[PDB]
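Notebook B, p. 112. Complex prediction, attempt 2.
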Amino acid sequence: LNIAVLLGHSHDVTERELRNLWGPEQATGLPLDVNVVALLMNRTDPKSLITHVCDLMSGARIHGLVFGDDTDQEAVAQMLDFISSQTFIPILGIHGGASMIMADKDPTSTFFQFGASIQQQATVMLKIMQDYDWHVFSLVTTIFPGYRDFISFIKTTVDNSFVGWDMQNVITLDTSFEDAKTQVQLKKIHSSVILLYCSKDEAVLILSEARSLGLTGYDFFWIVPSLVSGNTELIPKEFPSGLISVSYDDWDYSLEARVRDGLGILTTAASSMLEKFSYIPEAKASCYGQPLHTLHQFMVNVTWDGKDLSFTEEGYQVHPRLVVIVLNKDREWEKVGKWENQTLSLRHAVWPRYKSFSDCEPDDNHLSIVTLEEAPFVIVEDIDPLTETCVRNTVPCRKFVKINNSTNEGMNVKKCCKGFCIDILKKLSRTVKFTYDLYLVTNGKHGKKVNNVWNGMIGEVVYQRAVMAVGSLTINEERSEVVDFSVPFVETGISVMVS
Amino acid sequence: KIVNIGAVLSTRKHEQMFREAVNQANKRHGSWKIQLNATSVTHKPNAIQMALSVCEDLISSQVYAILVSHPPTPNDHFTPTPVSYTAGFYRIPVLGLTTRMSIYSDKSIHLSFLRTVPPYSHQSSVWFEMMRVYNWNHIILLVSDDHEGRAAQKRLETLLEERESKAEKVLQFDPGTKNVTALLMEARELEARVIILSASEDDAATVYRAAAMLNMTGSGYVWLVGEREISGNALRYAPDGIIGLQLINGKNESAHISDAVGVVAQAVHELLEKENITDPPRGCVGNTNIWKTGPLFKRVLMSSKYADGVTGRVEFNEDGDRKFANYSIMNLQNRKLVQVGIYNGTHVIPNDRKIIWPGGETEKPRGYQMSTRLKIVTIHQEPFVYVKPTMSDGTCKEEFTVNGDPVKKVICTGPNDTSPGSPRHTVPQCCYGFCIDLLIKLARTMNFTYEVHLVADGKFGTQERVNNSNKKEWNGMMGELLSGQADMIVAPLTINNERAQYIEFSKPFKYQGLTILVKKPEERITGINDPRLRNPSDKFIYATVKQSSVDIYFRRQVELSTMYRHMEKHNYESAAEAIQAVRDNKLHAFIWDSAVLEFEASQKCDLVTTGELFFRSGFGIGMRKDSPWKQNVSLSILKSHENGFMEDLDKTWVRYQE
Amino acid sequence: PDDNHLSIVTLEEAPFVIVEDIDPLTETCVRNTVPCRKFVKINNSTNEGMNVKKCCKGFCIDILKKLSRTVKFTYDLYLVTNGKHGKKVNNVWNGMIGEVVYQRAVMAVGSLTINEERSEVVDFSVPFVETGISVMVS
Ligand SMILES: *[C@@H]1O[C@H](CO)[C@@H](O[C@@H]2O[C@H](CO)[C@@H](O)[C@H](O)[C@H]2NC(C)=O)[C@H](O)[C@H]1NC(C)=O
Ligand SMILES: *[C@@H]1O[C@H](CO)[C@@H](O)[C@H](O)[C@H]1NC(C)=O
Ligand SMILES: *[C@@H]1O[C@H](CO)[C@@H](O)[C@H](O)[C@H]1NC(C)=O
Ligand SMILES: *[C@@H]1O[C@H](CO)[C@@H](O)[C@H](O)[C@H]1NC(C)=O
Ligand SMILES: *[C@@H]1O[C@H](CO)[C@@H](O)[C@H](O)[C@H]1NC(C)=O
Ligand SMILES: *[C@@H]1O[C@H](CO)[C@@H](O)[C@H](O)[C@H]1NC(C)=O
Ligand SMILES: *[C@@H]1O[C@H](CO)[C@@H](O)[C@H](O)[C@H]1NC(C)=O
Ligand SMILES: *[C@@H]1O[C@H](CO)[C@@H](O)[C@H](O)[C@H]1NC(C)=O
Ligand SMILES: *[C@@H]1O[C@H](CO)[C@@H](O)[C@H](O)[C@H]1NC(C)=O
Ligand SMILES: *[C@@H]1O[C@H](CO)[C@@H](O)[C@H](O)[C@H]1NC(C)=O
Ligand SMILES: *[C@@H]1O[C@H](CO)[C@@H](O)[C@H](O)[C@H]1NC(C)=O
Ligand SMILES: *[C@@H]1O[C@H](CO)[C@@H](O)[C@H](O)[C@H]1NC(C)=O
Ligand SMILES: *[C@@H]1O[C@H](CO)[C@@H](O)[C@H](O)[C@H]1NC(C)=O
Ligand SMILES: *[C@@H]1O[C@H](CO)[C@@H](O)[C@H](O)[C@H]1NC(C)=O
Ligand SMILES: *[C@@H]1O[C@H](CO)[C@@H](O)[C@H](O)[C@H]1NC(C)=O
Ligand SMILES: *[C@@H]1O[C@H](CO)[C@@H](O)[C@H](O)[C@H]1NC(C)=O
Ligand SMILES: *[C@@H]1O[C@H](CO)[C@@H](O)[C@H](O)[C@H]1NC(C)=O
């Protein structure tokens, strides 16, 4: 039917491709009287919003509104929901503040957003934390609402988990902080990874405080949702370089593809409802002077171009494109992870450090440690295929296994390690308080000088890929020449086995 | 020097009194050159044009706080959402004066919304004070709506956190139906009689007509409603003698207009004390810059402490509502709402008006039926609960002990086997033994009768996952207790953390731990400290009963995960299956409580227990939540501990060796 | 507005609460022990006594330390000078029961038997050790 499409001005988006994006497209056009009106608007105030709505609803009875925001105001989606409630016109949130997740839609509304729920996004963030083995965490929230369902979903997920998520309790803030009483709440944090759920300026103030509190370290990770970030074309100040964000503002899922998918959903709903009822165009007359066959109760399971763009009861995409990004060393947001219907397709199995989160950060504690497979000391087992998590009395590790014998390609399969020296490594990590990155050696055994080239754990220490050799290792003169041992902790000489 | 203040009201004399009170407040608060102008906007049938008038009239006028002031709206829309949604774009604090809705109580959609009237959630505070004063314990939540009822139940549980008591029956359903007599009939057969109603006017009229059809106007019915239940024909359909609450001068408009003046003017003078003086811009040409002192001036509105007020001392809470909720307690006395209560916030003061009740006396005590029938569930364990079919039909065998004592049996109700094993064979059978005699002693000590049934499946009950929402639900005896199918678990309940995380317990009657039953040359295994069990094999077959406390205790200890990898191979349903397996050498070890294995070692000479005792726990009576049987039964069990009654129960089955 | 200190009284029992003098080499309770005071009176007629600091250790002290690790609270552990565990001497409880009933102590973390009248006057927690009675012979 008659569909209005208005967008912002960001992402180098002109208007002529919006003219050419409806015409030759929609090859399977089942309704007859379908037309589009593509407009733009610099003003993002609700005055101009109500003005353009009353100009386009009377503008030859437009049955569908497509709005795209470029700013970072979450109340614009609330105003669009109010417009969809008053005018009974299906409105699709596309970009910016129009695409931001609001709290509770009306059941008598027709407004829908192209965004994931807070529960699916918390599931993605806990999938990140499970795949990267960051188990002890906390939660800092302000009085900016939507946090109660978030805390409830986190508690029900931890109660329904086989990981064993240790968690210091949720830190709440009272008011606009004087840095007097909320600082006592922030000093309670002694964990590594902190989850932050608040608005944008509140996130700027809290991250500036954590910079002043020294909570932006190498071990101190911050994972924020899309409500913190807002938009990818504007990256503000006082974000640590390595800030993990989960959003969906991708250039790959571009704004032209956004409005094309929106037109596809609208025409699919109108065409599949046209086979049920005849008089599908039934629009509101005017804004002045004061319905059963509606498209709201119909598109629960809608699919265009093979893309599962089905809509939930609360107005969410069932399988959207969740994008996990980080802040690089050059103040940009690099795309790291994409999300399937069930799994999270990651790019870096080993977590990249992003060492300079800020300027003054001496980070000399990411100690790379190699170890060797032995039966009484380093028990190396597969991860549990039913839970995809090492049991908490073990440590994670990786092994570089070459799949194909033809070339030197290989993969870092993550496995579990336990035993005697693993307990030594854990007690050193809990006494000296250092981070450790453990991996198996792939070149072979302990090591031997062959053609004046060391290998094994000795070679990994000498060629500086391994900081220390925690795994089981003997001591002779040549090793004490080429490396330096610690004190001996177990009396292990040679011995003869007989029957 | 002038500042336009937005008012949303029709009748112009209210704005005249508003300007008069604002001028009086500006006269007595310094010689600063500020002026406060007022702008009025009126009724429109179309909310789009309401939002149009608000945006093209007030935002360009540089308003600071817009007042929701439409009480007498004849339409059933009740939408000041144009005002709130327009002023939320610039974080302007919207002040409400008219309604008490939960959609405005939530800060989620309406961010900076404060108001001078507390919502219907503080009726739960008043009713909690009524339960504290007039000794009421159990309630019934009857909500015909769905939206406000969730927040009402959340505030109800937040206020009942001090007692940790909950409602026996909470209800949420679709309005506009007339077939709720089934739900009222199911609420009739319960024990609580304090009924809480919170719905619309027509929904209240419908449920009052349904209660009149089910003649719930009799004695013992404790009705306690708000103000939406005494309006219209719901006032007529209400029973004569129902207790409600009413706004003290809430419908009187100029009182809270003057209260809003006394808040807003001195809040402006408090905002002019400190720095960061920002103003909302003229939102006409692209003026979408956020007002940075939104939360700051909101905090000025939150910490607003005054003494003036016709209704009383106005003060705002930490939730944007009104502290110290005070309401008139009304009674429908012969088709007349009579003010039978003038409320002080800490104690209730009834006046000299007689409270005519539909039931009996003029007082309002607790109304219950003292739980005359208690459903009791147990599980099949022979040294604790012997379960046998009857002799001919219902009657039991008059069995005599070694001292001529007739065994005091009970007619339990049990199935033949599980649902795959037995399609439908569930009969009243005979049950007796240890815990049965304990239950008979408790039923003789305290003054109540009971009912004994059996568990459906063959499990104790663990917090196991369910398909939808990936939620860990319950099953077994706990799954039958929490579903209301049982009233008090009298069974060998191994007390641990997770079972006590949800329900409360009693003091244990039996104190023992865990041990191993084996078959007995070096034929010894000797308890948990065997490294042959630490590193198992294919011939050391050890397992446990499926979904028991043994699996919970060996699942918490992750260093015992290896046994957790083994016991899943041969999990059984009942312990007698494990006894028959270990007697025929199908099982090589079995982790179990000490009493049953020592009893079977007394019965059978080939079955030999070990001595390494671990996880010294207690068998306690599985109890409910906050309930009037937690203290009396515990004192009765401790009275059984102090004398030799537990010695006599040992002399029945436990102590005697064979 | 905060509150985490708990006035806690205990009583000396030889496998549970061992109360010893402070080490004179360091003037410090050794790390498994916790500090406490004892209102020592040198002689009978003088009511005035000195709160001499001593060191508590044992089983219930380990229980109190692990509870302070988990529940994250503080305490002021001290000893009783009224006498033994508890006995209603003409509607007057003595010892730890007289401390808790008359609210001079918040809770008695120290070792204490449970019977009917003690469960009447105060409230107990879940039990943690199987302690009935027994008879010692040769
Ligand atoms: C201060 O209040 C006066 C009240 O009269 C406002 O005057 C009104 O302004 C509107 C808009 O221009 C007119 O439609 C009315 O007719 C005016 N009232 C009359 C009868 O004079 C005045 O505009 C307010 N000041 C500001 C700047 O808003
Ligand atoms: C809107 O129009 C003004 C006119 O000068 C222009 O400067 C501005 O870039 C446009 N968009 C924004 C960002 O306000
Ligand atoms: C899609 O949803 C409708 C209900 O709106 C249902 O009737 C239909 O079976 C679903 N489509 C499929 C999978 O057949
Ligand atoms: C989930 O994933 C695929 C796409 O990767 C999708 O086609 C299908 O619906 C689902 N399949 C599985 C493995 O459940
Ligand atoms: C190894 O090579 C084969 C083809 O020879 C290919 O099928 C396989 O995918 C390769 N391994 C990888 C990349 O996993
Ligand atoms: C080398 O070849 C074998 C052939 O089955 C296969 O396991 C895999 O391709 C390679 N194995 C190794 C050694 O990784
Ligand atoms: C439904 O309503 C009818 C008529 O009022 C009544 O007879 C019937 O018992 C009700 N059914 C139930 C029990 O829900
Ligand atoms: C009304 O009261 C009668 C007793 O007079 C009893 O049958 C029942 O409580 C109700 N039955 C009817 C007719 O609704
Ligand atoms: C509001 O209450 C006051 C005090 O009772 C009264 O004087 C006044 O007339 C009322 N307001 C109205 C309706 O004018
Ligand atoms: C009860 O009402 C009086 C008079 O209106 C006033 O003191 C206050 O509003 C209430 N008292 C309380 C709750 O302290
Ligand atoms: C309620 O009682 C308290 C008792 O001090 C008092 O402070 C308050 O003003 C009373 N409210 C009234 C007057 O009803
Ligand atoms: C119990 O068991 C079988 C089913 O397994 C059933 O058919 C039979 O009737 C029952 N037998 C007895 C003991 O009554
Ligand atoms: C127990 O209750 C019954 C009434 O149900 C009555 O005999 C009396 O109140 C009580 N009897 C004794 C001895 O407790
Ligand atoms: C989920 O459903 C499957 C059947 O599809 C069933 O085998 C399984 O036991 C169920 N699991 C849970 C967690 O309830
Ligand atoms: C518990 O015991 C006391 C003893 O007098 C009794 O007064 C009280 O009513 C009992 N509670 C219940 C609910 O039976
Ligand atoms: C208590 O008695 C001893 C021995 O007679 C004496 O040395 C001491 O001074 C007395 N202490 C007092 C005076 O309290
Ligand atoms: C008085 O105190 C002393 C210890 O200082 C003790 O030896 C003596 O028995 C006490 N006198 C009596 C009988 O209370």
